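#dry-run=false #mode=assembly
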Amino acid sequence: YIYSTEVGGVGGTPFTFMQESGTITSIKFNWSDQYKLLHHIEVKFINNANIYATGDPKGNHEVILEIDDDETIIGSVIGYKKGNDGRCTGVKLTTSKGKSIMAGYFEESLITTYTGKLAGIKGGAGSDIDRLGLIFLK
Amino acid sequence: DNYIYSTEVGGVGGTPFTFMQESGTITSIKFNWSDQYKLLHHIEVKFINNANIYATGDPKGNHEVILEIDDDETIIGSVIGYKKGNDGRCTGVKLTTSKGKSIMAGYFEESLITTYTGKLAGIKGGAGSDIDRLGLIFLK
Amino acid sequence: DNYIYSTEVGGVGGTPFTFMQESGTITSIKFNWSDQYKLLHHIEVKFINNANIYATGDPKGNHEVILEIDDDETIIGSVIGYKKGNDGRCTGVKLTTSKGKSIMAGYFEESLITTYTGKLAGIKGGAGSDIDRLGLIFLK
Amino acid sequence: DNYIYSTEVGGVGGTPFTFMQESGTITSIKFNWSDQYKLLHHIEVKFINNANIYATGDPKGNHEVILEIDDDETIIGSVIGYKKGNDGRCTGVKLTTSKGKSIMAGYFEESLITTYTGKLAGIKGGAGSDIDRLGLIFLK
Amino acid sequence: DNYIYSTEVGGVGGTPFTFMQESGTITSIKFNWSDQYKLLHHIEVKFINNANIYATGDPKGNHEVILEIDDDETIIGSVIGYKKGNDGRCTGVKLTTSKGKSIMAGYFEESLITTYTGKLAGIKGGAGSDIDRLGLIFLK
Amino acid sequence: DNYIYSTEVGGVGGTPFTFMQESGTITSIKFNWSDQYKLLHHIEVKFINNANIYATGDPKGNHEVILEIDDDETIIGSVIGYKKGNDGRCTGVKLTTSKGKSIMAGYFEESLITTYTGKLAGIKGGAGSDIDRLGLIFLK
Amino acid sequence: DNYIYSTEVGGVGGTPFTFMQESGTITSIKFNWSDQYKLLHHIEVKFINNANIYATGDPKGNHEVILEIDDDETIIGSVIGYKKGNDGRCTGVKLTTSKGKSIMAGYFEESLITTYTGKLAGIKGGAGSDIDRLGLIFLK
Ligand SMILES: OC[C@H]1O[C@H](O[C@H]2[C@@H](O)[C@H](O)[C@@H](CO)O[C@@H]2O)[C@@H](O)[C@@H](O)[C@@H]1O
Ligand SMILES: OC[C@H]1O[C@H](O[C@H]2[C@@H](O)[C@H](O)[C@@H](CO)O[C@@H]2O)[C@@H](O)[C@@H](O)[C@@H]1O
Ligand SMILES: OC[C@H]1O[C@H](O[C@H]2[C@@H](O)[C@H](O)[C@@H](CO)O[C@@H]2O)[C@@H](O)[C@@H](O)[C@@H]1O
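#status=ok
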């Protein structure tokens, strides 16, 4: 496993979504024009009908990316407000098959992450996504 | 199964539909939508070697688009727009094929799914006056 | 047959027509249309090794385009615009070839089909004053 | 023959002309046109191994463009603009070669033909004060 | 050495810094800058196999960008903007990697260097309230 | 000969010039032009293995461009602008090489020729105060 | 020699300079220019395996640009702007490398040379308060 920097604030309840010998097949991002933040994320893993969720699903928008079993992330950008009082603002992902999604806003700070097979996510959430970091295979 | 089910997106309303063929795939798919409600109202599908039309929803929109699919031709990119919620609806579809054919139907103002790719084999969801919910189905 | 029939789109009106030739393909196609009605009115087709001009519909429009097709040249992209319904009509045609030639004829305000691709071999549909419906025919 | 004849487009007016040479091809072509009438008026042509200039039409226009063609050079895209009708006229010519050379001469605010491609071998049509019609001729 | 040192650009101010490691390269670099002063203020760096964060300058800017670098990933394009002079400053950085990742930080209004390319191994310069001077370091 | 002569374009005025060398090619060419008259006034040429500068016309323009040509480098695109007529003049030159070098000199408002391509070997035409006419010369 | 000398462009004044090294090539070049006079004023050059900085002209401009050159990296495009005349001057430089690096320094309002390409090995010309003239030098 490769751990990409968790970006955003130090707030919210911790979460770690990863599963032995499995990878992410679906990820959903929920955000608002009201606060220009991510509020909620859900993830499903290959061979597991369970939905792992975090944060309050209170936003007016929601995008889903479904990921073929041989499909990698070749480009990834997370927008955030920096600081202890920080927050995760947006996500742009682009895959090895030219699929892409764009969620929320990118007006303050950006990270272009590591690339590879997306395997999990970790960070903190409450009303909002406080911090978010991606996890890849090695 | 031998099938991949992409998420049914939209609401919980309407009459169920499931359109698949055991040793067959979709060769033609049609989307009907309105500028009045910015929704998808009606869908039709034909399957390889079968002139019969499987249809669902009320064909009441002012626009229709049809995509024909060559027998060796895959979907390499697929986006469905929808309103989220139990009271949700399907809003638009963009498909792009392995031969650079593409279609764009309805609106993409609220929520989006970029689906799984592959040989498009069927569709399932619910419809009434509108397309309440839609999920694509692929081979392996 | 050894032919692929793309959906005839438009209305149910007009006199039937079918233009094909055994062991022959289309080398020239002409579209005639009006800004007055935003419709196709007339189509002509010539086939390799055949000096005859096969025509249908009333040649009443203010615009004409001709596409000539080299013997080894395929259609790699094809879009037909139409008004849907029993009362429908064929509104426009956009073709792009394997040699980067392209044409755009009439209007695409209501409904679209992206057809099958391949070596264009014939056309079938109905015409009178206008082109009621039209469908392309390719080779396998 | 061993020649491919693109459609002569334009009107039925003027004196006929045919510019070809057995075992020869065109190395230079000149188009003369006016902003006053938005028409071609005059064409000149030279052939490989022949210092003679073949001309047709009245050279009265304010613009002139010349395309020289290398011996292994081929036309990969060609458009002629024209006014349709018995009283028709040739309005413009756009050629693009296999070496990325191109020219654009006169106007295209009317009917258009995308012709056949290949080694340009000659031209035929009718001319007087104006170029009434024009058709390209290629090898095989 | 085993290292290529690109010119330190900017002023002679601030506290020196040198961030390198034996048998190691940079996996993460962060730039902090302001719209108020159109300068870089703060930089952080992590190295492969070392959870420590090496920092310099005052983190007082309204913007931050981070570039994470895969173990086999090189810099193929690099531009640093700066004010020249003893009282100089580092104004902006544009980096582009061998995997098409890129970042753009701060402003490019006065002077530019396009640096040497390769596997980024470290950085060195001076910082205080702002980043006074900066120079990249690559492998061989 | 072993030479290809592009059309001399422009007027019939000025003193003749012909600049060529057996078993030699052009390595440098300079064009001098004015915004006052929108004409070329002066041209210079150097040949491989020959320190001499061959010049013609009055060097009175406010602009000069020089193209140096590597020994294996060809002209793949060439455009000369001119006023047609007995009282004609050469107005501008665009050249583009096999290595993507290019130059653009003077104006292109009236008439254009896209010439033959190849290894540029010499120039011929007439000059006085202005470049009256100009024709390029290539190898085989 | 084993060197190619591109035309020195600009005026005949300034103090002569020639920067070359046997079995060595340029790894860094810096250009200093002003918006006040729209001229280059100063140039510095470093060579592979030589910590010395070779400089010429008065470093009085408000802008500076530096290009670093990897050991296997060539100039594939070079453009120098200048004022022509005995009282001439060098106005700007644009360089593009075989790795897609580039720089742009000063102004290009009067005259241009698109010089020879290859491995940049040295520079020669004249300088004082400004860069009177400048010529690049390449390998073979
Ligand atoms: O196409 C040009 C035309 O030139 C000559 O006729 C011209 C003129 O004299 C006539 O008055 C008008 C009438 O329509 O036509 C031309 O402008 C003839 O050579 C004619 O055959 C030719 O078409
Ligand atoms: O990095 C800029 C600057 O930082 C520090 O200087 C600060 C302050 O003490 C100085 O007085 C003012 C300028 O006079 O600049 C900053 O506010 C020092 O580290 C200095 O070396 C450096 O230039
Ligand atoms: O290109 C710089 C220029 O520097 C020197 O000339 C300077 C001065 O001495 C001249 O008199 C003024 C004229 O007002 O021009 C410069 O300021 C000389 O080295 C000269 O050759 C050179 O051009």
